[PDB]
Amino acid sequence: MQVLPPSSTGGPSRLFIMRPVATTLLMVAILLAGIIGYRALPVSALPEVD
Amino acid sequence: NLPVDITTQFQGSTLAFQSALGSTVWLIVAAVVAMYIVLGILYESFIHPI
Fold first, then answer.
1. Closest residue of chain B to A22, computed from CA coordinates
2. What turns on this gene (chain B)?
């Protein structure tokens, strides 16, 4: 998508301002996934470079 | 009054049922969170998914 005139003054992110609940729940899910990952993903001392 | 070197160990239904109990609560919580998120995406509202 090249430099087009803004679509009804929203740019390429126009639909994003039309989704309040969607955004709020998306970032709630992102925070929950990050918390359960930091409690679940595998933290090692060194990379697996053998 | 068995000798102190006598221990016990069990297998089968007890382990399966304990694993099921451990999995059920987290499964229900994650599922309910997922439905809340998708329904909020579909309706763009707070109390409609509830």
1. B41
2. The mdtABC operon is transcriptionally activated by BaeR.
